[PDB]
Design a protein around this motif. Sequence first.
Motif, short mmCIF file in Angstrom:
data_model
loop_
_atom_site.label_atom_id
_atom_site.label_comp_id
_atom_site.label_asym_id
_atom_site.label_seq_id
_atom_site.Cartn_x
_atom_site.Cartn_y
_atom_site.Cartn_z
N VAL A 184 0.81 -1.21 0.00
CA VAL A 184 0.00 0.00 0.00
C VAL A 184 0.85 1.26 0.00
CG1 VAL A 184 -1.66 1.33 1.38
CG2 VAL A 184 -1.83 -1.18 1.26
N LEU A 185 0.57 2.18 -0.93
CA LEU A 185 1.15 3.51 -0.86
C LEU A 185 0.38 4.33 0.17
CD1 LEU A 185 3.16 5.69 -1.85
CD2 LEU A 185 1.47 6.27 -3.62
N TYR A 186 1.12 4.85 1.15
CA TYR A 186 0.54 5.61 2.25
C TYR A 186 1.56 6.70 2.53
CZ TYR A 186 -2.29 6.26 6.49
OH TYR A 186 -3.14 6.75 7.46
N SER A 187 1.16 7.96 2.43
CA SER A 187 2.13 9.05 2.53
C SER A 187 1.71 10.23 3.42
CB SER A 187 2.48 9.59 1.14
OG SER A 187 2.85 8.53 0.27
N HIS A 188 0.41 10.33 3.70
CA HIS A 188 -0.13 11.53 4.32
C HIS A 188 -1.25 11.25 5.31
CE1 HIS A 188 2.16 14.21 1.78
NE2 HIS A 188 1.83 13.47 0.73
N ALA A 189 -1.49 12.22 6.19
CA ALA A 189 -2.48 12.05 7.25
C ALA A 189 -3.86 12.55 6.86
CB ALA A 189 -2.03 12.73 8.54
N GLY A 190 -3.97 13.19 5.70
CA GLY A 190 -5.24 13.73 5.26
C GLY A 190 -5.20 14.46 3.94
N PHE A 191 -6.38 14.82 3.45
CA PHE A 191 -6.53 15.57 2.20
C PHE A 191 -5.62 16.79 2.14
CE2 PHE A 191 -10.72 13.39 2.25
CZ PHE A 191 -10.65 12.79 1.00
N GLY A 192 -5.05 17.04 0.97
CA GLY A 192 -4.15 18.15 0.78
C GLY A 192 -2.72 17.82 1.13
N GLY A 193 -2.42 16.54 1.29
CA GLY A 193 -1.07 16.10 1.60
C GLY A 193 -0.60 16.53 2.98
N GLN A 194 -1.47 16.36 3.97
CA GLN A 194 -1.10 16.66 5.36
C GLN A 194 0.02 15.74 5.81
OE1 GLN A 194 -4.59 16.89 7.99
NE2 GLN A 194 -5.83 17.23 6.15
N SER B 275 1.10 11.30 10.54
CA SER B 275 1.17 11.26 11.99
C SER B 275 2.22 10.25 12.45
CB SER B 275 -0.20 10.84 12.55
OG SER B 275 -0.12 10.47 13.92
N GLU B 276 2.73 10.44 13.67
CA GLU B 276 3.64 9.45 14.25
C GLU B 276 3.01 8.06 14.30
OE1 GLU B 276 6.78 9.49 15.12
OE2 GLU B 276 6.99 11.57 14.46
N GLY B 277 1.70 7.99 14.53
CA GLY B 277 1.02 6.70 14.55
C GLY B 277 0.98 5.97 13.21
N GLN B 278 1.28 6.71 12.14
CA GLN B 278 1.27 6.15 10.79
C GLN B 278 2.69 5.86 10.29
OE1 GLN B 278 -0.73 9.57 9.23
NE2 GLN B 278 -2.75 8.85 9.92
N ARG B 279 3.69 6.05 11.15
CA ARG B 279 5.08 6.01 10.70
C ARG B 279 5.48 4.70 10.02
NH1 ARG B 279 5.16 5.81 16.29
NH2 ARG B 279 6.38 4.17 17.33
N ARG B 280 4.87 3.59 10.42
CA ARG B 280 5.25 2.31 9.84
C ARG B 280 4.70 2.14 8.43
NH1 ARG B 280 4.97 -2.76 13.87
NH2 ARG B 280 6.67 -3.38 12.43
N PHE B 281 3.82 3.04 8.00
CA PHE B 281 3.11 2.86 6.73
C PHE B 281 3.76 3.63 5.59
CE2 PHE B 281 -0.93 3.39 9.56
CZ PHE B 281 -0.63 2.24 10.26
N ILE B 282 4.66 4.56 5.92
CA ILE B 282 4.98 5.66 5.02
C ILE B 282 6.04 5.35 3.97
CG2 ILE B 282 5.74 8.06 4.85
CD1 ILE B 282 2.97 7.47 6.24
N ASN B 283 5.68 5.62 2.71
CA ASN B 283 6.64 5.65 1.61
C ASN B 283 6.28 6.77 0.67
OD1 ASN B 283 8.40 3.09 1.72
ND2 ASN B 283 6.31 2.22 1.90
N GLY B 284 7.28 7.36 0.03
CA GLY B 284 7.04 8.22 -1.12
C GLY B 284 6.80 7.35 -2.34
N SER B 285 6.41 7.99 -3.44
CA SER B 285 6.09 7.27 -4.67
C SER B 285 7.28 6.46 -5.19
CB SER B 285 5.60 8.24 -5.75
OG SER B 285 4.49 8.99 -5.28
N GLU B 286 8.47 7.05 -5.11
CA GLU B 286 9.67 6.40 -5.63
C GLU B 286 10.00 5.12 -4.85
OE1 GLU B 286 13.41 8.61 -5.42
OE2 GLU B 286 13.81 7.99 -7.49
#
Lengths: 451, 451
Positions: free
Chosen positions: B156-166, B169-180
Motif C-alpha cells: 500500500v502507498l501511504y504518505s499523508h495524514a489527510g486531504f491536501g497532503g497533510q 502522523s507518528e502513529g502512521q510512521r510504519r506505513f509511510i513511503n514516497g512514490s519512488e
Amino acid sequence: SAIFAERALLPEGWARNVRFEISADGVLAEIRPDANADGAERLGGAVLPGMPNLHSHAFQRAMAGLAEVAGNPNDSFWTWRELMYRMVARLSPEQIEVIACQLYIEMLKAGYTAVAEFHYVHHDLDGRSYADPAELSLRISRAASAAGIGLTLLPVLYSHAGFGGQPASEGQRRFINGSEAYLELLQRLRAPLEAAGHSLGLCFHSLRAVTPQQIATVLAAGHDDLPVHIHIAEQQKEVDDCQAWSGRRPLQWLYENVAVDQRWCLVHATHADPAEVAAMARSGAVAGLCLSTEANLGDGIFPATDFLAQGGRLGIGSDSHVSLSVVEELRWLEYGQRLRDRKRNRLYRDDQPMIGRTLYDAALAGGAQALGQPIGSLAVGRRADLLVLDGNDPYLASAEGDALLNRWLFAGGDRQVRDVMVAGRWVVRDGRHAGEERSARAFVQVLGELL
Amino acid sequence: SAIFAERALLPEGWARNVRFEISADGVLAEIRPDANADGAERLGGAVLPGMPNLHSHAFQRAMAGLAEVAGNPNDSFWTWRELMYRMVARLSPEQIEVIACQLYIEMLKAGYTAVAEFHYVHHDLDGRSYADPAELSLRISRAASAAGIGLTLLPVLYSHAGFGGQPASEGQRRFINGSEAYLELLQRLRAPLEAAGHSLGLCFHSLRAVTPQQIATVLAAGHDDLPVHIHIAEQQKEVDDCQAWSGRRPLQWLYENVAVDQRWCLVHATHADPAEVAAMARSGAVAGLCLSTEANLGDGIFPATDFLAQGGRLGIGSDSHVSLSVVEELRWLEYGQRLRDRKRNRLYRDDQPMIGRTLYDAALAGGAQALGQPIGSLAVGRRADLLVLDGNDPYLASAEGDALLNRWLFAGGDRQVRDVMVAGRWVVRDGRHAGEERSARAFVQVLGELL
Ligand SMILES: N=C(N)N[C@@H](CCC(=O)O)C(=O)O
Ligand SMILES: N=C(N)N[C@@H](CCC(=O)O)C(=O)O
Ligand SMILES: [Zn+2]
Ligand SMILES: [Zn+2]
C-alpha cells in the motif's frame, strides 16, 4: 453432583475457581468461588448462564432459507407469509414433532437452554380439532423433553384475519380458536406441562388476529401467574392498518387499552415511536427482539439504544429459525444500531462500557423474565442451565472476563460453545447431542416428504 | 489427480456426477459431467468454486472483538482507529507473520480460498525501513504459503495524514513511503511473489493518504498488468472532508481525475450517490464490500440493489477480520438491503431469482477480478480452488441446486464447509487444517505478548 469452573460468570460478575453443587432435581444448591475442585467434574472452558430463546415457531425451521427467491420486484413479509401458509397446510402431527425435536437439538448446540414456543398450529389439516384439542401442544412438549431443552409453551389465541375482527382466512384454519376454547386448552395444558417440568404462558397472536374484547376476556380469566406474549408493531403496514382501524399506533393502542406490565413480552415491537419506547421501558415489559428474522423479513431496526437508556428490558428469539445462534442475534442487535447511527459501541450501560457483557446481561434477564422460568443467572435456587465455551480456543484462552465475551460475541461464533447443561443434565458435550443421529435421520425424511 | 462430485456448481450451472482432472500444477484440466467415478476421489458433498476474499489487513485479527468497549457516548471509526494504531505500534515481524498464518488458516476453514492482502505495515517500530524494505511483505507471502491460501499481495502507498497532503502522523510512521520508494518496493516484490505462485497489485490507501500527483505518478509507471485497489467513501466524514478539499465527493473526484476501469477494486464505496453508483457500474470496477467490518465500524449500507441493477460488479472482503465467514458476508449483504428497504429478496438478477445463487455468482466473479487471479469458476484452465459442503447435513442433503445455496447462505453456516482445496491441494479436510495445532500455539503466545 458437582462441577468446577476455572472461570464463570456469576451474578456479581466474573469469578474464578467456582465449585457448583447441583441438586438431584437440577437446581443450583451451592456456588463457591475460589474453591477446590476435589471430586467435581472440571469444566473445559469459561462458564456462562444459558441463553433463553424467548420466541419460536418451531415448524418454520423446515422452510428456513427456502423463501429466498424473488417472485416479485417488491417481495415482502406478506408474500413470505403465503409461502409459510402453504407449508403449514401440509404438516402432519408426526412431522411437526420431528421438526421441533431437531430444532431444539440445534438450539441447544448454539447455547440456547430454554425456549418460549409461540405455538399457533392447533388443529387438523381440515381446521377441525383433534379428539384431544391439545394434540399438537403435547407433541411440542414431548419434543422439548426429548431434546432436553427448557420450555415455556405459549399456546396462541388466533381468531381473525385482520383488524376489526375480520373473518379468518382458509390459510389460517389450523390456528383458530374462540376465547372459550382457547381458555379450555390453556387450562388443560397445565397438568401435562407441569408433569414435564415445563412452563406455560398466555399468548395473543397479534392485534390483527384477536379483538379487544377477546384480550379483555382472556386477561380477566384468572391466569395471573402466566407470562403474556404478543407480536406487535413488526411491520409498517400493521402500524398503518392499526391507525386506520383505531386512530392509534399498535403499541400506543395496547398501552392505552391494556395494563401492560412485567408479565408481558412484546415480540418485535419494531415500529415504536419515542413515546411508545418510553411507555415500554416504564412498564417493565420485555421487548422480544428477533434480529435475524426481522432482517430476513425486512421489518426494520428497533430503537434499542433509546429503549436501553430508559431502563428497557429485552431478550432474543430465533423466531422463523433462519438463524440458530446466540452470537448472531446479539452481534447483529448491536450492528443494526451501528449501521443506523453510523457510530460504534451503541448498547452499553452507565456502569458497563463492555458491549458484549451489556448484551449478554440484558438478554439473559429479559429472556428469563419473558419465559417465566427460574433461569438466566447462576445463583442458588435457580435451575442449572449453563454453557461451557472452548477453553482451548486461542482467542478465548488469551482473554479474561468481559473481554472473553467480546471475543466470542464479536469475533467468534457458535462452535466456541462446546458443552451445554439444562436442568443439571449434560445435553451437549464437545458439540454433540446424544440424540442427533436419530433426529437428523427422521428430519431429513420429513424434509423429503414436504419438499 | 482426479476428483468426483455427485453435485457441482459449474459455470453453466449445477451439474451432476462431475469428474474433474487436475494437473500436477493444480490447474483444472478436464471437467466432465455425467461421468463415472472410476479411480477418482469421491467427494463428500456439493462442490462450489472457492470464494475469493478481496480485502484483508491481517494483523487486525489479533484485536478482533477487543474494540467493543464504549469509551465515549459517540464512539466511532475514528476512536477505533486510535486503538488499531496502538496495536500496530507494538507488532514485531514475527508476530505479524504468526497472526497472518493463523488468520489464513481460519479463512480457508470458512471457504475463502484466496485473499487480497491490503498491506500497509512496511517499516520497523521506529518507522525506519528494514535492511530489505520488503521484510514484512515477504513474511505475508511466507504465511500464505504456509497456510496454503491463494494470495494477491497489495503493498500500500501511504504518505499523508489527510486531504491536501497533510504530514503523516507518528502513529502512521510504519506505513509511510514516497512514490519512488513505493515503486521500488512494488517492482522488487515481483520475483519473490512469482516464485511462490502469488500475485501482486497496486494500491493507494485512500484519497486521504496520498496526493493526486502520487496517483498519477504511480499509474504512469508501467505496471499495467496489475489490479488497483483503494479504500474510498467508507465514512461520511471522508465525504465531507473531500468536498471541503476539492468541492467533490470521493468517488466523484476519483472518476473525474483518474481513468477508473476493470482493473480497479473500490473498497467499501459505501457513500455513493446515484451518479457515483452509475459511474461505478459503467466502469466495470469491482466494489469491495466488507459487510461485517462496515457494520462493526458503523460505516453505513452500500446501495447494492441500485448498483447490481446497472450491471455492477462486487466481491466480499473480511477486512478487520471481526468475521471470517463467507456465509455472514453474503447473508448480511442481502439483509442490510432488506433492513434499509423494509422488503425481502433484494439482490437478484433478471435471469436469476434465487438470492443465494445471485450473491455467490456475483462475489465469485468480482473477487476473481479484484484479485487478478484465474479463479472464481470451475472451468478448464482455471485454478483448482474449491469447497465441499457437508453431504450428510440434512438441510443440504434434502436440497438440490440453487436451493442448496439458499439453505447454506441463509439457514446454515460455516461448519457446513467441510473440505477445501486450493491449487489442487487439500488444505482443509473434515474441518481440519494440518497446520492448525502448531499455528494456534504460536498464535496464543503472540496474543499473550500483545495483551
Ligand atoms: N410475523 C412473523 N414473523 N411470523 C408470523 C407470521 C404471520 C403473521 O404475522 O400474521 C407467524 O409466524 O405467525
Ligand atoms: N477504514 C478501515 N476500515 N481500516 C483502515 C483504517 C485506517 C484508515 O482508514 O485511515 C485501515 O486498516 O487502514
Ligand atoms: Zn413470531
Ligand atoms: Zn480496509
